[PDB]
Paper text:
Topoisomerase II (TOP2) enzymes are essential regulators of DNA topology during DNA transcription, replication, and repair. Topoisomerase IIβ (TOP2B) plays a role in transcriptional regulation and is expressed in all cell types including post-mitotic cardiomyocytes. Both isoforms catalyze the reaction, where one DNA duplex is passed through a transient double-strand DNA break in another DNA duplex. The ATPase domain of TOP2 is highly conserved between TOP2A and TOP2B and is composed of an N-terminal strap, a β-hairpin that is unique to eukaryotic TOP2, a GHKL ATPase domain that binds and hydrolyses ATP, and a transducer domain that conveys mechanical motion to the DNA binding and cleavage core of TOP2. Here we describe the development of the obex class of TOP2 inhibitors that bind to a previously unidentified druggable pocket in the TOP2 ATPase domain to act as allosteric catalytic inhibitors by locking the ATPase domain conformation with the capability of isoform-selective inhibition.
Author numbering:
A (entry chain A), B (entry chain A): 44 to 362, 365 to 432
Write the structure that this text describes.
Amino acid sequence: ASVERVYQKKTQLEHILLRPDTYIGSVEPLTQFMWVYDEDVGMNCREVTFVPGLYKIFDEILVNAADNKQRDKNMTCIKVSIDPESNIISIWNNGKGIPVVEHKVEKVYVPALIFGQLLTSSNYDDDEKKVTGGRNGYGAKLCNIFSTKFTVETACKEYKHSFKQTWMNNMMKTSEAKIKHFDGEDYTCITFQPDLSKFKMEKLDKDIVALMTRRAYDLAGSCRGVKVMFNGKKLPVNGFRSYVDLYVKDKLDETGVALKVIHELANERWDVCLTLSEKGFQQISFVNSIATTKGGRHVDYVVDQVVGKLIEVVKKKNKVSVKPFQVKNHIWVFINCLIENPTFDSQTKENMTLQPKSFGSKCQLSEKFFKAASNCGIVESILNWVK
Amino acid sequence: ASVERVYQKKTQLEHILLRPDTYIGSVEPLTQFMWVYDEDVGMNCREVTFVPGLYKIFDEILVNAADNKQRDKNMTCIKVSIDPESNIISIWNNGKGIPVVEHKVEKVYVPALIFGQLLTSSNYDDDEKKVTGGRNGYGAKLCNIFSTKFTVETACKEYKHSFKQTWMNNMMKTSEAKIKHFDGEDYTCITFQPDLSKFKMEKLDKDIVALMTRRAYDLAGSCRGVKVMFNGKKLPVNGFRSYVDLYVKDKLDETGVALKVIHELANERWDVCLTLSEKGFQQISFVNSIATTKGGRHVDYVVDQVVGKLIEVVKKKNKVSVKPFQVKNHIWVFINCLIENPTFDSQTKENMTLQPKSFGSKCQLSEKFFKAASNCGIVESILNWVK
Ligand SMILES: Nc1ncnc2c1ncn2[C@@H]1O[C@H](COP(=O)(O)OP(=O)(O)NP(=O)(O)O)[C@@H](O)[C@H]1O
Ligand SMILES: Nc1ncnc2c1ncn2[C@@H]1O[C@H](COP(=O)(O)OP(=O)(O)NP(=O)(O)O)[C@@H](O)[C@H]1O
Ligand SMILES: [Mg+2]
Ligand SMILES: [Mg+2]
């Protein structure tokens, strides 16, 4: 093999298709137990087989819609549609659209720049301490690259125009955008057909649809002041506590006693629920409406407070050694938080790495909350083990 | 704020400095309990404060050296030097050097291409089923970008020349390489001064040095057939079992009984040790000499086999329900494995996501190993809990 065959340089676009994993996660199937929202049973935990990268390209567009609530606090609604037969997914939001105007430096329409060129973002100036989920300038282009058809429609009264442009064939083909006069209520709608061949799939099957549906429920629970519709029907979740109820309101512990679920909205940026776990530590958490399914420093920040206080309570009835991991083993925690300029080790944003001193706010749980935590069965499980 | 201030495009090089986290991990301090190799006590677990991105740029160069054992199986030695006073780190390896010749497509010397331009690699052709750690074509450039001085020296008898080139100021300045006749024993040596200002550090302190030193011990344990020297002295680790001994050979369980450590080299590509944990599930694992500190499917693949067999043993003395997470809670596992074309969700490569069917080999632990596992205190811990 020649020097030129061995030592190769790739373009950014080539690298995404060759090495999709650090951009969207695995493009091969994964089977694991997890929470989904099924047509027959609603929220449930079961074995699911799905391709992470396909789930992620949907997530990128969904979080972008949630992020618009930061650009326009008057936004009220996100509508999600999934049609497996046609292979069409659409995510629509109201509030301010995207300026339909030529960017004077890049010499293209703003929506064409930020959906059709890599490393483009309104989130690159960190002197603004934003609580958007978007950080890197990739997500929407990644969905485009992994779609056979990707359409951006946006309407922005301030700039008096609407914009519609369609890309095809993994962002490699497009045509002139349709620009029209507009003076109505702003919106953005992203409609895409995922390139299932990139994920070795024949169709959007029940498992991936159940995961994408649950993500819409997550959004209804995490994005304050935004109602969510799925396939034309409003989701009956009106805040984080009602979302948490989907997991624990109808559940018993192993002794047949209903789970005691405690809750505190510490402040606008920190909403916490907690109950007993009997299958090891569990956490369901959101940072800026991103599902941080591998946790991060926000989870540790909340959990460490609870663990410290519960160790205190146990000690007052111990008289041998109760270690923090043993307490954490009995905790099921739910967190919805807003973090300024969060960091993650991956574009997938499953683990949030920013240290608490940089969050821009604190979550100092009240003594009332800690007392309630001492009554939800965790202490009893530990003390029974101190025998 | 104007459209041009709000909506911004970044170059690849700008994006690395603006968003370092998905390239090298966090550039802010982190404090946590972990294993390091200290000058006073050797291998020990203690609270450490360090900057992940600094540790990672060192790791990138170290794994590149290990990877040369795949290019040249005759390689025998890696030498690591760290001088905190001068702020100079060097990593040297023998075996084949890098061709000192002009790349006919890129029109630069091969070493200048692959250390000085992004997205350059000999690991981009996956039809070769390689067990190198390198996959993405970033690591060496990331170290260069995060160094105030970065020197590449390589000597390649086949091409009859040696090469030395120095970059400065975060890869933004360089000068003509020194090319000389060479007909000796090949080597490559990477010498760099990390840009401590990028990590808000004044010096390479004891904690970061102890982490980097432990990584050299990891390499002595994981890279078959390669001896490792640190600051001029050979590390007395001659294989994976002797490496594992640094953690467990002198340890007792909480009842005062020595840990029973079991071992099986299932085949050339899978080396496994296992013992009892009393602080929850623990894993120390390597994929292609990468420290997979967040685990991955290789860990799950090994652990699930052990858990399944130990549940069998417990059941034969149970007569209530023993759940897999409870068994895993008592396992400390050590894995050194070689995986073809591994995948990870991050450039940092802490979690290996490739499914076992794609590994290119299997690890089917023997019935002898499972019997030994049933005698290392895990079953006893579980059974005592079934009371
Ligand atoms: N629904 C939307 N409404 C308004 N603006 C949007 C919407 N979706 C995307 N944008 C804009 O398009 C830009 C590019 O989106 P995207 O590629 O996802 O990058 P990002 O969200 O800034 N960062 P990341 O998602 O971390 O890669 C965003 O920064 C927004 O300015
Ligand atoms: N010590 C070394 N000896 C020989 N070749 C080397 C050495 N270090 C680096 N290289 C070469 O330089 C290339 C670029 O290194 P690097 O930037 O780390 O990319 P990579 O190792 O291929 N992938 P990654 O580390 O996953 O980003 C490698 O692919 C090798 O061909
Ligand atoms: Mg985004
Ligand atoms: Mg490398």
